[PDB]
Amino acid sequence: MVLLPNRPAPEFKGQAVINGEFKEICLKDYRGKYVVLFFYPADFTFVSPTEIIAFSDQVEEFNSRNCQVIACSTDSQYSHLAWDNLDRKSGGLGHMKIPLLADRKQEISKAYGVFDEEDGNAFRGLFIIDPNGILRQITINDKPVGRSVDETLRLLDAFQFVEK
Amino acid sequence: LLPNRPAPEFKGQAVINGEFKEICLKDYRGKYVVLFFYPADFTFVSPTEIIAFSDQVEEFNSRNCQVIACSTDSQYSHLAWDNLDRKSGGLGHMKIPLLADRKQEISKAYGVFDEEDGNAFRGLFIIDPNGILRQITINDKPVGRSVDETLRLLDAFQFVEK
Amino acid sequence: MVLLPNRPAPEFKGQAVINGEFKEICLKDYRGKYVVLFFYPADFTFVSPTEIIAFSDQVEEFNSRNCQVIACSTDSQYSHLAWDNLDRKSGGLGHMKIPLLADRKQEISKAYGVFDEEDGNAFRGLFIIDPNGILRQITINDKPVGRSVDETLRLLDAFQFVEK
Amino acid sequence: VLLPNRPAPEFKGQAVINGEFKEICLKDYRGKYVVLFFYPADFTFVSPTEIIAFSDQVEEFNSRNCQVIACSTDSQYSHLAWDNLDRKSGGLGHMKIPLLADRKQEISKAYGVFDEEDGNAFRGLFIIDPNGILRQITINDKPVGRSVDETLRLLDAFQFVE
Amino acid sequence: MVLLPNRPAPEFKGQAVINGEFKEICLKDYRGKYVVLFFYPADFTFVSPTEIIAFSDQVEEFNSRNCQVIACSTDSQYSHLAWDNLDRKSGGLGHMKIPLLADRKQEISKAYGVFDEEDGNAFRGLFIIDPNGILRQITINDKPVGRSVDETLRLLDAFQFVE
Amino acid sequence: VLLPNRPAPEFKGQAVINGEFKEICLKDYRGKYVVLFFYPADFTFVSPTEIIAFSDQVEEFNSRNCQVIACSTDSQYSHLAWDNLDRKSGGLGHMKIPLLADRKQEISKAYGVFDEEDGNAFRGLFIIDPNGILRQITINDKPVGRSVDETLRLLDAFQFVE
Amino acid sequence: MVLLPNRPAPEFKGQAVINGEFKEICLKDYRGKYVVLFFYPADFTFVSPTEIIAFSDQVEEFNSRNCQVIACSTDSQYSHLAWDNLDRKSGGLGHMKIPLLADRKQEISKAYGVFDEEDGNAFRGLFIIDPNGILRQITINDKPVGRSVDETLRLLDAFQFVE
Amino acid sequence: LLPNRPAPEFKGQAVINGEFKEICLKDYRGKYVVLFFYPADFTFVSPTEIIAFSDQVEEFNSRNCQVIACSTDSQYSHLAWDNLDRKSGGLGHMKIPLLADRKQEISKAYGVFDEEDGNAFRGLFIIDPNGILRQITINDKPVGRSVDETLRLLDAFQFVE
Amino acid sequence: MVLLPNRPAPEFKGQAVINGEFKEICLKDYRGKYVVLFFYPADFTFVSPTEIIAFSDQVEEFNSRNCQVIACSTDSQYSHLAWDNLDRKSGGLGHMKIPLLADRKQEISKAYGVFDEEDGNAFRGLFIIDPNGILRQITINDKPVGRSVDETLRLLDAFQFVEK
Amino acid sequence: VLLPNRPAPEFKGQAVINGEFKEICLKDYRGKYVVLFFYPADFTFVSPTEIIAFSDQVEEFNSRNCQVIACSTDSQYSHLAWDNLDRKSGGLGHMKIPLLADRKQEISKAYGVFDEEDGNAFRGLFIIDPNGILRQITINDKPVGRSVDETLRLLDAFQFVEK
């Protein structure tokens, strides 16, 4: 059905573009931190990728909250690096402040239940994961509609409150 | 559960304007539906949520949207809570319907049912005028939901619906 | 299932309202004492409070008999506590001298075979259980019709007579 | 699975009525209430006191539009013999209620009063309505008998709320 | 699965009326002796009492032949005791010289293959078993026709000749 | 094991009659009683004195409208050879009783007399009425023979109650 | 489906008539020697005794080859013995020089695949088995048609020349 | 595999006279058929058998019988083997059909298929004009079959017909 | 298992970039013409475009042989388009004279057995399919090694010879 | 699925080398590259051109540390006879490469080149690395043959890739 809160988040592992470079990352690496893992359908189509860029520009709001924000797609790492190295006016991302994770085997976005079998693209999900790897928040949007940084930080603040 | 798919059907007994009516999703065809879940009656944050939505109900009326609240509690718990006034830990008199899922069917169909306590996680679902599910939100039980954010999403979906 | 007498009574464990407080209780707590476990369909109803109050006012008849009465419903412990705190004039229970057990996962009502798949409410069952946790008597009433204290008392007296 | 909003299990069998063999089924009793009670065996101590106690009170059930049937796994011949046996000698005297014989153990298993530990049914009592729907379930451990008065009370309540 | 002569007789354990009183018995209680186990449909009937009585009157023949005769029906022991206490004039057995076995759970007559599923009654069987607990003779009659003590004596002698 | 209220199992086989092979069925004998009896093997000791004892008494079964048939797992050829032989050498002399061959083991297995150890029948005797309904089952351990007069008695009793 | 050469012959065990006397024989007994195991449908027939006698008269031909001939049929050992007591002029075997093997339970005929489900009799098979119990030659004839001792001998000779 | 039953149907490429021709058992209705198997082409004891059956072919023609040789080799191996003279180790050009069982159906359906290699045991099967199996012979690979015994058998079956 | 020649080739249908535009194409579109379907692991990779390009420059060779060449990978058509608008000076494709087919759903590469479960990319496959949709030639190269235009031309010619 | 980066299917069988029978397997060839190629049948038209073409060039592969092996569903005897037959006569001359008989169909089935409609292998070609890991896969429909120069090119490319 749906992933449930108060259950361990699905393990993910994969190639990510981090600071213009390819790195193998997984969920276990983030132990001790909150994690916002959000998905988007594709590279090189938005047609203005304002949403991911919004999370990249607000990133210190998350870093001060002891939270790591990770963007993810079914595109490969090369498509990711290419999209990132392209400047915003030209349609690209510009250079992002968050990791761009590529799941090319579809298994990650399937593990989080956001995978759409029609286009082979992920619906835009957002998942909040606690320092121990437990799932807290599940947000899944239809593709045409984006997500809010403020809401994400409100939720995060609430969970960190219930924490202490 | 996924967006852009037909929303799971539900039929249930509900408290509407101080009395029982059986309602189903098919009845709301032609307008959006916000269906939200809460763990139990006679609790702390849940009534704050429900009262928040019911007090903002005109915002949903102007958007042609119908908000419904749901619990695994019986319609009798629901009605007793509806009759209890705000200051005494009641709901006052609610301007949105209270759906009772006593067979656990609706919570399970929407995948918000928690096998641990027999209660629902706090789910919120935006369903389109054709009965297609546009949005899925699921909150861990300690944390509530925003009416503002819901309205934002609703406005986005209605904007994209041309 | 219909349960049969002279067999071990199904184990139950759950949260209950006792003295207006949440406790966790189970059948094995009552070893050495008889247990009358009776069910009713729902809180904030009509015949159920008359039943429960009738059994509550008589609690010393059961206690002098070394027997523990427990009421059970599919309602939560919050609905139970809310009803219990409501006075009789306002339609509540006044204040109950017997434990009000919430079976919210349906497990207890199902293990005793009194669960109704139709409305998700228990039929009015009543079960007498000896200090060894063995089932003694079975009474299951249709929802409109209630149960008698003096009859349960009679049954109890009989079982304790043939006990030793 | 045995629960009292449902149609009662249909029984059919040979019975002793006024000292003769007569085949009866549940459907012959449409329009009336039925109290169907089981006892472990013929030619015992506790059981005849129950059968005699109910048969002596038979007018209370007749006044209530109800038919009382006793059932055991014994053959109809054992039934007949016990019936012919004088009250003083441990017999039933001549019964005013039908004595149902379940030799195949189908009716005891149908009402779930049969225990494989021995060949006998528990002391069951089932109140069934004019439409053949089950109302009351009672199952006693074998040493402990049953009350006529409680049966009358139950009957009165069911007939009252109907 | 069919029960045959050279195979070990099916074990049975049940309640019996012996000399007026209740006692639990089993086949192994009878090891060291021959056993004639005969079934009848029910207590308080017509053809059965003359038969069982006819066996009980000849009981000394079986005794002197080192044989134990056991009668079995699906009735309980209270029915058995009842029928045994009833004097013969009334249609009772008078007091039997052989045990009356009760199989209420139907498992004994089912184990010997004599159980009718049309009613809860046993077909009229007879089984000759040896001191080692092995089957010897199997005889099943239609209910309208009774059994002969003479033929059972002949069979018993015939087996005791060979073993 | 067989019960005697039921249709007797159907057999079809090669029989030796008057010293010649003929194909027989149980249905050829309808309207008549039938005694079907089994023996382990040809060219043995007890079986010939049995079959001969029955063959000499054939007139007794004739007057009762009953047909006696001997059956074994031997072929029709061993049956024939056994017949043509003289009673001094162990043979049967010449039989008035048909010798049925069960070479497929069908007829013995259908009557439940088949021994899997040596692959041949115990001593069965089955009384079947004119309608093909099974009446009497008798099964003897191999070393012990059967009574002609007990069979005649049973025949008379069944015919009596008929 | 059918037995195969260069694979261990199916083990057989049972009662056989040897020199007018019953014996219990099996294929293990004959290890170290060749075996010709042949089947015939029934005792007291026309062609089968022709075959059997033809093989019995020449037994010394198989003895000089270190080979044992064994005849087998679904008839019992008693029918076998009776057939072996009968003169050849009277339709019997005379007194046989080869083991006459009864397979009553039809195990041996079925293990060798020759069993006819129709009449309950074996087709006329012939099997040649080496000193290690390994199956070499397989011959199965329709029932009206018999076999040659000459050809059997030929086969044996070829196997032994190859051995 | 018993001889009262209809013989398993075979279909396949045969080499007759040096050409590829499709044949099947039902082509042969009304005649007796002896089907014999051999392990492989270009082997030592097989060509002698096959040649012995071929030099005697008319013995089978007088009896209304068709002899067919069959193996698991391809029709190209059959052709190559059949063209080659015996002085060079071939069959010369011979009078009976050479059936290729490449898909190994025919050998498996007749129970002559060995699974240690891909070859058929030397089977010999006699089949009546109505396509019913009469005689079953299976020899271990080192040992060959007689033509005289085959004629004898065929005569016996023809007589009992 | 691997595909075989002389059997109907798996039907592919997908979204493709032709002349800088999106168009839905399938296999049955190409009836009457031969089809060379070749797979490559990913867009925006290091040297793969040199192979794809080598095939692109030679398109006339295939066109005069009545063959249609199709390039296919698991990238989205958006990646395809971006890479096909990138000049080779940047490492892009220049512009392709060959249709760029996008198998996002992994269906085509799975059905053609060239999909590998390790990185979620296709191996370097090549499939020669006659005008009736019958598989004729199968070539599968390990990712590090490219293929040849000339051997493909030779095979194409051979199949066109034996067709007549 | 049969894919490049996985270890190649292990094959074992009787092959002909220098007009002589050797049993070989894949495990023999560790340390060397291996080109395995399949053809439908012996004594055909197209296939001998291929086999001879690969053979006459054998040293080109030997110098590249590669072992070229040909395989068909024919026996080793067909292989041998075809190898003895002169080229002018349509034979193989004398092979400089191993000729591998798959008579059990196993090797051909393991490489997915087996054609059920035939019993003959499609013409496959498989390049295997020294470590036993597959590299290249090519399968032709039967009428179309394969190129030696392209094989050499592929080999060069792989070895240049790894070194």
PDB file of N, CA, C and O in Angstrom, chain E residues 2-7 113 116 123 136-142 144-146 148 151 154 158-159, chain F residues 1-4 6 112 115-117 122 135-141 144-145 147 150 153 157-158 161:
ATOM      1  N   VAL E   2      -8.651 -51.503   4.285  1.00  0.00           N
ATOM      2  CA  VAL E   2      -9.643 -52.490   4.687  1.00  0.00           C
ATOM      3  C   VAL E   2      -9.038 -53.387   5.766  1.00  0.00           C
ATOM      4  O   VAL E   2      -7.856 -53.720   5.707  1.00  0.00           O
ATOM      5  N   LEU E   3      -9.830 -53.771   6.763  1.00  0.00           N
ATOM      6  CA  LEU E   3      -9.315 -54.666   7.798  1.00  0.00           C
ATOM      7  C   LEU E   3      -9.420 -56.139   7.383  1.00  0.00           C
ATOM      8  O   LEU E   3     -10.475 -56.604   6.952  1.00  0.00           O
ATOM      9  N   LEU E   4      -8.304 -56.855   7.507  1.00  0.00           N
ATOM     10  CA  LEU E   4      -8.186 -58.229   7.020  1.00  0.00           C
ATOM     11  C   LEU E   4      -7.826 -59.204   8.136  1.00  0.00           C
ATOM     12  O   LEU E   4      -7.318 -58.791   9.176  1.00  0.00           O
ATOM     13  N   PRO E   5      -8.088 -60.507   7.922  1.00  0.00           N
ATOM     14  CA  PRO E   5      -7.804 -61.526   8.940  1.00  0.00           C
ATOM     15  C   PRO E   5      -6.361 -61.644   9.463  1.00  0.00           C
ATOM     16  O   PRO E   5      -6.210 -61.736  10.668  1.00  0.00           O
ATOM     17  N   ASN E   6      -5.328 -61.628   8.628  1.00  0.00           N
ATOM     18  CA  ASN E   6      -3.987 -61.900   9.161  1.00  0.00           C
ATOM     19  C   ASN E   6      -3.316 -60.689   9.820  1.00  0.00           C
ATOM     20  O   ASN E   6      -2.200 -60.790  10.327  1.00  0.00           O
ATOM     21  N   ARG E   7      -3.996 -59.548   9.788  1.00  0.00           N
ATOM     22  CA  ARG E   7      -3.481 -58.322  10.383  1.00  0.00           C
ATOM     23  C   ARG E   7      -3.910 -58.177  11.842  1.00  0.00           C
ATOM     24  O   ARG E   7      -4.919 -58.747  12.248  1.00  0.00           O
ATOM     25  N   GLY E 113     -14.898 -50.819  10.759  1.00  0.00           N
ATOM     26  CA  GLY E 113     -15.513 -50.695   9.450  1.00  0.00           C
ATOM     27  C   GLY E 113     -16.993 -51.024   9.405  1.00  0.00           C
ATOM     28  O   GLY E 113     -17.569 -51.171   8.327  1.00  0.00           O
ATOM     29  N   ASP E 116     -22.397 -47.429  10.033  1.00  0.00           N
ATOM     30  CA  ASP E 116     -23.320 -46.937   9.020  1.00  0.00           C
ATOM     31  C   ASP E 116     -23.311 -45.418   9.100  1.00  0.00           C
ATOM     32  O   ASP E 116     -23.323 -44.863  10.192  1.00  0.00           O
ATOM     33  N   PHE E 123     -23.556 -51.598  12.060  1.00  0.00           N
ATOM     34  CA  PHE E 123     -24.031 -52.808  11.411  1.00  0.00           C
ATOM     35  C   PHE E 123     -23.760 -53.948  12.363  1.00  0.00           C
ATOM     36  O   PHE E 123     -22.964 -53.804  13.292  1.00  0.00           O
ATOM     37  N   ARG E 136      -8.935 -62.661  13.321  1.00  0.00           N
ATOM     38  CA  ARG E 136      -9.094 -63.985  12.744  1.00  0.00           C
ATOM     39  C   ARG E 136     -10.331 -64.004  11.859  1.00  0.00           C
ATOM     40  O   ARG E 136     -10.233 -64.182  10.648  1.00  0.00           O
ATOM     41  N   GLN E 137     -11.495 -63.818  12.474  1.00  0.00           N
ATOM     42  CA  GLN E 137     -12.760 -63.903  11.741  1.00  0.00           C
ATOM     43  C   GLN E 137     -13.473 -62.557  11.605  1.00  0.00           C
ATOM     44  O   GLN E 137     -13.532 -61.778  12.556  1.00  0.00           O
ATOM     45  N   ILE E 138     -14.004 -62.293  10.412  1.00  0.00           N
ATOM     46  CA  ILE E 138     -14.811 -61.104  10.156  1.00  0.00           C
ATOM     47  C   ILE E 138     -16.181 -61.506   9.624  1.00  0.00           C
ATOM     48  O   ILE E 138     -16.279 -62.171   8.593  1.00  0.00           O
ATOM     49  N   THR E 139     -17.239 -61.109  10.323  1.00  0.00           N
ATOM     50  CA  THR E 139     -18.589 -61.421   9.868  1.00  0.00           C
ATOM     51  C   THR E 139     -19.513 -60.214   9.961  1.00  0.00           C
ATOM     52  O   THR E 139     -19.716 -59.675  11.035  1.00  0.00           O
ATOM     53  N   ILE E 140     -20.082 -59.789   8.838  1.00  0.00           N
ATOM     54  CA  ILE E 140     -21.012 -58.664   8.875  1.00  0.00           C
ATOM     55  C   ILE E 140     -22.374 -59.013   8.275  1.00  0.00           C
ATOM     56  O   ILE E 140     -22.481 -59.355   7.097  1.00  0.00           O
ATOM     57  N   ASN E 141     -23.406 -58.912   9.107  1.00  0.00           N
ATOM     58  CA  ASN E 141     -24.774 -59.247   8.723  1.00  0.00           C
ATOM     59  C   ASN E 141     -25.587 -58.007   8.426  1.00  0.00           C
ATOM     60  O   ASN E 141     -25.343 -56.945   8.999  1.00  0.00           O
ATOM     61  N   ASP E 142     -26.521 -58.134   7.492  1.00  0.00           N
ATOM     62  CA  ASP E 142     -27.528 -57.110   7.307  1.00  0.00           C
ATOM     63  C   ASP E 142     -28.335 -57.065   8.593  1.00  0.00           C
ATOM     64  O   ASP E 142     -28.592 -58.102   9.203  1.00  0.00           O
ATOM     65  N   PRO E 144     -31.483 -56.856   9.499  1.00  0.00           N
ATOM     66  CA  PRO E 144     -32.609 -57.771   9.732  1.00  0.00           C
ATOM     67  C   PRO E 144     -32.237 -59.203  10.146  1.00  0.00           C
ATOM     68  O   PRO E 144     -33.101 -59.907  10.670  1.00  0.00           O
ATOM     69  N   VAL E 145     -30.998 -59.635   9.920  1.00  0.00           N
ATOM     70  CA  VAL E 145     -30.625 -61.024  10.213  1.00  0.00           C
ATOM     71  C   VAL E 145     -29.608 -61.160  11.341  1.00  0.00           C
ATOM     72  O   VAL E 145     -28.517 -60.598  11.280  1.00  0.00           O
ATOM     73  N   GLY E 146     -29.975 -61.932  12.359  1.00  0.00           N
ATOM     74  CA  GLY E 146     -29.130 -62.127  13.522  1.00  0.00           C
ATOM     75  C   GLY E 146     -27.989 -63.106  13.318  1.00  0.00           C
ATOM     76  O   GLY E 146     -27.791 -63.636  12.224  1.00  0.00           O
ATOM     77  N   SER E 148     -25.407 -66.471  14.835  1.00  0.00           N
ATOM     78  CA  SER E 148     -25.470 -67.763  15.503  1.00  0.00           C
ATOM     79  C   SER E 148     -24.326 -67.951  16.492  1.00  0.00           C
ATOM     80  O   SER E 148     -23.163 -67.721  16.163  1.00  0.00           O
ATOM     81  N   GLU E 151     -22.201 -71.146  15.206  1.00  0.00           N
ATOM     82  CA  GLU E 151     -21.197 -70.869  14.188  1.00  0.00           C
ATOM     83  C   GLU E 151     -19.945 -70.227  14.787  1.00  0.00           C
ATOM     84  O   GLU E 151     -18.827 -70.518  14.364  1.00  0.00           O
ATOM     85  N   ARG E 154     -18.004 -72.935  16.447  1.00  0.00           N
ATOM     86  CA  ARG E 154     -17.329 -73.741  15.441  1.00  0.00           C
ATOM     87  C   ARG E 154     -16.080 -73.033  14.949  1.00  0.00           C
ATOM     88  O   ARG E 154     -15.030 -73.647  14.786  1.00  0.00           O
ATOM     89  N   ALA E 158     -12.247 -74.115  15.415  1.00  0.00           N
ATOM     90  CA  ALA E 158     -11.448 -74.259  14.202  1.00  0.00           C
ATOM     91  C   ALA E 158     -10.128 -73.508  14.311  1.00  0.00           C
ATOM     92  O   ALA E 158      -9.083 -74.007  13.900  1.00  0.00           O
ATOM     93  N   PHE E 159     -10.175 -72.302  14.865  1.00  0.00           N
ATOM     94  CA  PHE E 159      -8.953 -71.533  15.066  1.00  0.00           C
ATOM     95  C   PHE E 159      -8.082 -72.122  16.167  1.00  0.00           C
ATOM     96  O   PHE E 159      -6.865 -72.203  16.024  1.00  0.00           O
TER      97      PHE E 159
ATOM     98  N   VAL F   1     -13.925 -51.722   4.489  1.00  0.00           N
ATOM     99  CA  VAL F   1     -14.611 -53.003   4.361  1.00  0.00           C
ATOM    100  C   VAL F   1     -16.067 -52.786   3.939  1.00  0.00           C
ATOM    101  O   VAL F   1     -16.655 -51.740   4.215  1.00  0.00           O
ATOM    102  N   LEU F   2     -16.640 -53.778   3.264  1.00  0.00           N
ATOM    103  CA  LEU F   2     -17.988 -53.663   2.705  1.00  0.00           C
ATOM    104  C   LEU F   2     -19.089 -53.638   3.771  1.00  0.00           C
ATOM    105  O   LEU F   2     -18.935 -54.210   4.849  1.00  0.00           O
ATOM    106  N   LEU F   3     -20.200 -52.974   3.455  1.00  0.00           N
ATOM    107  CA  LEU F   3     -21.376 -52.948   4.322  1.00  0.00           C
ATOM    108  C   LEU F   3     -22.555 -53.556   3.577  1.00  0.00           C
ATOM    109  O   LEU F   3     -22.700 -53.349   2.375  1.00  0.00           O
ATOM    110  N   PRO F   4     -23.396 -54.327   4.283  1.00  0.00           N
ATOM    111  CA  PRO F   4     -24.486 -54.996   3.569  1.00  0.00           C
ATOM    112  C   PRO F   4     -25.853 -54.302   3.492  1.00  0.00           C
ATOM    113  O   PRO F   4     -26.853 -54.997   3.677  1.00  0.00           O
ATOM    114  N   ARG F   6     -25.779 -52.168   0.643  1.00  0.00           N
ATOM    115  CA  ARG F   6     -25.362 -51.450  -0.552  1.00  0.00           C
ATOM    116  C   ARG F   6     -25.257 -52.390  -1.737  1.00  0.00           C
ATOM    117  O   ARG F   6     -25.099 -53.593  -1.558  1.00  0.00           O
ATOM    118  N   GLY F 112     -12.471 -56.539  -1.298  1.00  0.00           N
ATOM    119  CA  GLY F 112     -11.628 -56.254  -0.150  1.00  0.00           C
ATOM    120  C   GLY F 112     -10.961 -57.459   0.487  1.00  0.00           C
ATOM    121  O   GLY F 112     -10.466 -57.371   1.610  1.00  0.00           O
ATOM    122  N   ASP F 115      -5.052 -60.042  -0.457  1.00  0.00           N
ATOM    123  CA  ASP F 115      -3.875 -59.974   0.397  1.00  0.00           C
ATOM    124  C   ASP F 115      -2.687 -59.520  -0.436  1.00  0.00           C
ATOM    125  O   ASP F 115      -2.367 -60.131  -1.452  1.00  0.00           O
ATOM    126  N   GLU F 116      -2.033 -58.450  -0.001  1.00  0.00           N
ATOM    127  CA  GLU F 116      -0.925 -57.875  -0.749  1.00  0.00           C
ATOM    128  C   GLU F 116       0.371 -58.632  -0.490  1.00  0.00           C
ATOM    129  O   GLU F 116       1.345 -58.490  -1.232  1.00  0.00           O
ATOM    130  N   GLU F 117       0.377 -59.442   0.563  1.00  0.00           N
ATOM    131  CA  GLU F 117       1.566 -60.204   0.923  1.00  0.00           C
ATOM    132  C   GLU F 117       1.875 -61.351  -0.040  1.00  0.00           C
ATOM    133  O   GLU F 117       2.965 -61.406  -0.602  1.00  0.00           O
ATOM    134  N   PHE F 122      -8.095 -63.960   0.765  1.00  0.00           N
ATOM    135  CA  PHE F 122      -8.464 -64.648   1.998  1.00  0.00           C
ATOM    136  C   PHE F 122      -9.728 -65.427   1.702  1.00  0.00           C
ATOM    137  O   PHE F 122     -10.210 -65.412   0.567  1.00  0.00           O
ATOM    138  N   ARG F 135     -25.749 -58.447   0.991  1.00  0.00           N
ATOM    139  CA  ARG F 135     -26.479 -58.969   2.138  1.00  0.00           C
ATOM    140  C   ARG F 135     -25.548 -59.478   3.235  1.00  0.00           C
ATOM    141  O   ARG F 135     -25.645 -59.049   4.378  1.00  0.00           O
ATOM    142  N   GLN F 136     -24.692 -60.442   2.914  1.00  0.00           N
ATOM    143  CA  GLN F 136     -23.792 -60.964   3.941  1.00  0.00           C
ATOM    144  C   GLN F 136     -22.302 -60.903   3.590  1.00  0.00           C
ATOM    145  O   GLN F 136     -21.898 -61.264   2.486  1.00  0.00           O
ATOM    146  N   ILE F 137     -21.499 -60.435   4.547  1.00  0.00           N
ATOM    147  CA  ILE F 137     -20.042 -60.485   4.439  1.00  0.00           C
ATOM    148  C   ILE F 137     -19.468 -61.466   5.450  1.00  0.00           C
ATOM    149  O   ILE F 137     -19.749 -61.375   6.645  1.00  0.00           O
ATOM    150  N   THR F 138     -18.658 -62.402   4.970  1.00  0.00           N
ATOM    151  CA  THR F 138     -17.925 -63.291   5.861  1.00  0.00           C
ATOM    152  C   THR F 138     -16.483 -63.419   5.393  1.00  0.00           C
ATOM    153  O   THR F 138     -16.236 -63.746   4.242  1.00  0.00           O
ATOM    154  N   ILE F 139     -15.520 -63.148   6.268  1.00  0.00           N
ATOM    155  CA  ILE F 139     -14.125 -63.322   5.875  1.00  0.00           C
ATOM    156  C   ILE F 139     -13.309 -64.131   6.885  1.00  0.00           C
ATOM    157  O   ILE F 139     -13.106 -63.716   8.027  1.00  0.00           O
ATOM    158  N   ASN F 140     -12.838 -65.287   6.433  1.00  0.00           N
ATOM    159  CA  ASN F 140     -12.018 -66.179   7.229  1.00  0.00           C
ATOM    160  C   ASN F 140     -10.547 -66.104   6.868  1.00  0.00           C
ATOM    161  O   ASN F 140     -10.173 -66.029   5.682  1.00  0.00           O
ATOM    162  N   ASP F 141      -9.728 -66.128   7.915  1.00  0.00           N
ATOM    163  CA  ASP F 141      -8.300 -66.337   7.790  1.00  0.00           C
ATOM    164  C   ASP F 141      -8.086 -67.644   7.045  1.00  0.00           C
ATOM    165  O   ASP F 141      -8.817 -68.614   7.248  1.00  0.00           O
ATOM    166  N   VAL F 144      -8.662 -71.617   7.987  1.00  0.00           N
ATOM    167  CA  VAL F 144      -9.958 -72.113   8.459  1.00  0.00           C
ATOM    168  C   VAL F 144     -11.071 -72.061   7.412  1.00  0.00           C
ATOM    169  O   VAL F 144     -11.290 -71.036   6.770  1.00  0.00           O
ATOM    170  N   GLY F 145     -11.774 -73.181   7.257  1.00  0.00           N
ATOM    171  CA  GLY F 145     -12.810 -73.313   6.248  1.00  0.00           C
ATOM    172  C   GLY F 145     -14.174 -72.782   6.651  1.00  0.00           C
ATOM    173  O   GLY F 145     -14.359 -72.281   7.758  1.00  0.00           O
ATOM    174  N   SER F 147     -18.689 -73.051   6.576  1.00  0.00           N
ATOM    175  CA  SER F 147     -19.803 -73.982   6.698  1.00  0.00           C
ATOM    176  C   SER F 147     -20.785 -73.806   5.552  1.00  0.00           C
ATOM    177  O   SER F 147     -21.160 -72.685   5.210  1.00  0.00           O
ATOM    178  N   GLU F 150     -24.166 -73.012   7.377  1.00  0.00           N
ATOM    179  CA  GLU F 150     -24.299 -71.658   7.896  1.00  0.00           C
ATOM    180  C   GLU F 150     -24.721 -70.745   6.755  1.00  0.00           C
ATOM    181  O   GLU F 150     -25.554 -69.853   6.931  1.00  0.00           O
ATOM    182  N   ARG F 153     -28.284 -71.455   6.199  1.00  0.00           N
ATOM    183  CA  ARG F 153     -29.061 -70.791   7.241  1.00  0.00           C
ATOM    184  C   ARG F 153     -29.272 -69.323   6.919  1.00  0.00           C
ATOM    185  O   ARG F 153     -30.399 -68.835   6.928  1.00  0.00           O
ATOM    186  N   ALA F 157     -32.673 -67.202   6.189  1.00  0.00           N
ATOM    187  CA  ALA F 157     -33.060 -66.068   7.024  1.00  0.00           C
ATOM    188  C   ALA F 157     -33.332 -64.829   6.178  1.00  0.00           C
ATOM    189  O   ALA F 157     -34.354 -64.162   6.352  1.00  0.00           O
ATOM    190  N   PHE F 158     -32.407 -64.522   5.274  1.00  0.00           N
ATOM    191  CA  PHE F 158     -32.571 -63.396   4.363  1.00  0.00           C
ATOM    192  C   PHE F 158     -33.814 -63.577   3.502  1.00  0.00           C
ATOM    193  O   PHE F 158     -34.592 -62.639   3.332  1.00  0.00           O
ATOM    194  N   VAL F 161     -36.934 -62.915   5.831  1.00  0.00           N
ATOM    195  CA  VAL F 161     -37.231 -61.515   6.119  1.00  0.00           C
ATOM    196  C   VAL F 161     -37.543 -60.740   4.839  1.00  0.00           C
ATOM    197  O   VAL F 161     -38.003 -59.602   4.879  1.00  0.00           O
TER     198      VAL F 161
END
